[PDB]
Amino acid sequence: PWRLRKXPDSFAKEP
Amino acid sequence: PWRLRKXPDSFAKEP
Amino acid sequence: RSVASSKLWMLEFSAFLEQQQDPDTYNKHLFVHIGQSSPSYSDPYLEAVDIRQIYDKFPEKKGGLKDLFERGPSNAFFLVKFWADLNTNGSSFYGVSSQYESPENMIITCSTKVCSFGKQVVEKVETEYARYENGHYSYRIHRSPLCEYMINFIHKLKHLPEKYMMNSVLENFTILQVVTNRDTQETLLCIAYVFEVSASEHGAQHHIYRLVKE
Amino acid sequence: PRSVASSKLWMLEFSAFLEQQQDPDTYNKHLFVHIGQSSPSYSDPYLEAVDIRQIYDKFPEKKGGLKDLFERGPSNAFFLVKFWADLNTNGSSFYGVSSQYESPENMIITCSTKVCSFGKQVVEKVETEYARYENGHYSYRIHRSPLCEYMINFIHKLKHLPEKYMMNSVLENFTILQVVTNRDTQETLLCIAYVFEVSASEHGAQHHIYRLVKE
Ligand SMILES: *C(=O)CCCCCCCCCCCCC
Ligand SMILES: *C(=O)CCCCCCCCCCCCC
């Protein structure tokens, strides 16, 4: 799942 | 006047 | 047949009002249009108009319509009568778009003169460069902002009570567009436009004519 | 801003839309996704980074796949865009895609767009674009390219789902890869990976742009 990948916090915060 | 000049009939007939 | 000389074809022309409902939703109203639906087998043959019948509705003397026509080529000259759709209805943008093709790679200049009683009131000049496209060249004037004078003019037309009154105002209003090869100064297309208010159910309409010497 | 940009090419616009004709003079256009804003080219903000290894399994990894392309470089041409798509829609219909690029040089470019499902290519579109000289630079535009049937059908299927979380679930395994190359030098000018979620904003579709890094 995308939620367990190493990605910045912004990836899951819709602007 | 415009309406009396020599032009085709289509000029005063909207398609 | 179409608005095409030997060297330039105008495939698209429109004037529109676009309104933003929200950041992803837009409504567009076309006042006048050519080439909105695709060219077809059944498109009508183009009738002819004797240009001497219209000289007084357009600028004359040096560089005027008569001067331009006599220099030629005569196959570059057209008269378009529009029946305009003025039935309109957030942020608003008034624009004009047009598209052209040529077999030649040219730098073109497009001059558009808005006229009242045959005399220029405002002019707009645009220089356009070519894009290569399947062995020919295309030119685009894309969503060019309609100038204040014409936006103002459209408002004032709508603020008249009756359509026959709109038509009477329009009897002394013309537009002349001249497209030239900047290098050679050859006239590529010259298009005279005249207007009435549409009463059609199926939207804006047009008739296109070749301008001839006889 | 000059964000999705290598040194040789900048992508100014990307949009996919649905256009509906009420009558011959009246058109409604709805935007699914877009990039574009009112700020000048030199506004170029700092972009966050994504370790490209974290996304390899969402794209084909054969010869000529994402890993292969990234290693060949230039690595500064590689970007990831996350869209929050506006799927809230309501006459004849046209589904279209529009894009725009700018370069200081006059190139013939090739744009390859591959739609991927579970990291496997399901459909490809290839386009060759030529420049127009404009305001001191060269412009490349795709104007109202028809959205392919697979994508029209995909959008229909997503909209018939009862719940927004279900749409997001389908989107977990949907990606698009866009490669723009100089047709003469075969140089990678831009490479953009796209991933999607359903928007919940009232100010339209949203996005975040990331640089892709080796880490
Ligand atoms: C300002 O930029 C003047 C240039 C004129 C551009 C041509 C616009 C054609 C307008 C057609 C609308 C007709 C409404 C009666
Ligand atoms: C078909 O020819 C494949 C090319 C795909 C074009 C990219 C379209 C981008 C789709 C954005 C809308 C997605 C909404 C879920």
At residue D136, φ and ψ (nearest 5 deg) are: 80, 5
Say how far apart CA D77 and CA D66 lie, in whole Å: 12
Shortest Cα–Cα distance, A8 to chain D (Å): 7
Q: Per DSSP, which regions of chain D are E strands?
A: 10-23, 26-35, 49-51, 78-85, 92-103, 109-117, 120-129, 132-134, 137-146, 174-182, 188-198, 206-213
Residues 6 or more apart in contact with residue D58 via CB below 8 angstroms: D116, D119, D173, D175, D193, D195
| Residues of B with Cβ-Cβ distance to C81 under 8 angstroms | 11
**8 A C-beta contact, residue D140 and residue C132:** no
Strand partners, D133: D138
Strand partners, D95: D18
Asked whether the beta carbons of residue D48 and residue A6 sit closer than 8 angstroms, the reply is: no
* Half-sphere CA count of A8, side-chain side, radius 13 A: 18
Rg (CA), chain A: 8
First vs last C-alpha separation in chain A: 22
d(CA D101, CA D11): 4
Q: Are C104 and C7 in contact (CB under 8 A)?
A: yes
What is the enclosing helix (H) or strand (E) of D173? none
Separation CA C72–CA C128 (nearest Å): 22
Q: Which residues contact D41 (CB under 8 A, 6 or more apart)?
A: D1, D2, D10
Task: State how far the alpha carbon of D185 is from the alpha carbons of D107, D181, D189, in Å.
Answer: 10, 8, 10
Nearest to D78 by CA among D63, D60, D66: D66
Sign of CA dihedral B4, B6, B9, B14: negative
Domain count, chain C: 1
Q: Which residue is closest to C47 within chain B, CA to CA?
A: B8
Min Cα–Cα distance to chain B from C54, Å: 9
Q: Whose CA is nearest to atom 3 of ligand 1?
A: C147
Q: Does the CB of B3 have a partner CB in chain C at under 8 Å? A: no
Contacts of C204 (CB under 8 A, 6+ apart): C30, C31, C32, C33, C82, C83, C84, C85, C198, D24, D25
For residue C145, say if its preceding peptide bond is cis, omega within 30 degrees of 0.
no
Contacts of C29 in chain D (CB under 8 A): 25-26
Q: By the 8 A CB rule, do D213 and D49 touch? A: yes
Residue/partner pairs of D132-135 with CB below 8 Å, 24 or more apart: D132/C129, D132/C130, D132/C131, D132/C140, D133/C129, D133/D106, D134/C129
**What is the DSSP-derived secondary structure letter of residue D69?**
H
Cα(D83) to centroid(ligand 2), Å: 12
Q: Which residue has the tokens 């290839």?
A: D126
Ligand 2: which atom is nearest the Cα of residue D158? Answer: 15
Q: Which residues contact D190 (CB under 8 A, 6 or more apart)?
A: D4, D5, D6, D9, D11, D77, D79, D101, D178, D179, D180
Cα gap D10→C204, rounded to integer Å: 39
Q: Which residues contact C90 (CB under 8 A, 6 or more apart)?
A: C19, C20, C21
Q: State whether the Cα torsion D199-D204-D205-D211 is positive or negative.
A: negative
Closest Cβ opposite residue C129 in set D23, D27, D132: D132
CA distance C27 to D29: 6
What is the phi/psi pair of residue D180, to 5°? Answer: -110, 120
Element (H, E) at C152: helix C148-158
Whether the CB-CB separation of D210 and D195 falls below 8 Å is answered with: no
Domain that holds residue D119: 1-215
Do the two chains D and B touch, given a threshold of 8 Å on CB pairs and at least 3 pairs?
Answer: no
Half-sphere exposure of D154 (CA within 13 A, CB side): 17
Chain center to CA of C60:
19
Backbone angles phi, psi at D201, to 5 degrees: -95, 160
Distance CA D60, CA C128 (A): 42
**Burial class of residue D164 in the structure, from the number of CB atoms within 10 Å of its CB (0-12 exposed, 13-18 middle, 19+ buried):** middle
Cβ partners under 8 Å of residue D203, min gap 6: C23
The best mutation among D17, D113, D153, D157 to test binding of ligand 2, ranked by most ligand atoms within 8 Å of the C-beta, falls on D113
What is the C-alpha separation between C173 and C179, in angstroms, rounded? 20
Q: Give CA–CA dist D6/C98, Å, rounded.
A: 32
Burial C43-69 (b: 16+ CB within 10 A, else e): eeeebebebeebeebbbeeeebbbebb
Computed from CA positions of residues C200, D20, D147, C132, in that sequence, does the dihedral angle turn out positive or negative? positive
Cβ distance D28 to C33 less than 8 Å, yes or no, reads: no
Contact C192, C58 (CB under 8 A): yes
Neighbours of C186 (CB within 10 A): 17
Identify the CATH number of the domain in which residue D185 sits. 2.70.50.80
From C115, C175, C179, C197, mutation site for ligand 1 pocket: most ligand atoms within 8 A of C-beta: C175
Q: How far is the CA of C64 from the centre of ligand 1 (A)?
A: 19
Helix (H, G, I), strand (E, B) or coil at D140: strand
CA–CA separation, C14 vs C200, rounded Å?
A: 18
Chain D hits for A9, Cβ within 8 Å: none
Q: Which two tokens stand for residue C36?
A: 């909105």
Chain-chain contact of C132 with D133 (C-beta, under 8 angstroms)? no
Sign of torsion over alpha carbons C159, C164, C168, C174? positive
Residue carrying structure tokens 């795709």: D142
- Count CB neighbours of D104 within 10 A: 11
Give the H/E segment covering residue C91.
none
**Would strands D188-198 and D78-85 be described as parallel, antiparallel, or unpaired?**
parallel
What is the 3-class SS of C57-89, one letter each residue? HCCCCCCCHHHHHHHCCHHHEEEEEEEECCCCC
Ligand in closest contact with the CA of C125? 1
Decide if C160 contacts C166 (C-beta within 8 A): yes
Question: Ligand 2, residues D115, D124, D171, D180: which to mutate, most atoms within 8 A of Cβ?
Answer: D115
Q: Indicate yes or no: CB of A10 within 8 angstroms of CB of D208.
A: yes
User: φ and ψ at D183, to 5 degrees?
Assistant: -65, -25
Between CA D191 and CA C65 the distance in angstroms is 52
Which one, of C1, C6, C8, C2, lies nearest residue C102 by Cα? C8
Q: How far apart are CA B13 and CA C147, in angstroms?
A: 30
C191 lines ligand 1 (CB under 6 A): no
The rounded Cα D105 to chain-centroid distance in angstroms is 22
| Cβ proximity of C9 and C100 under 8 Å | yes
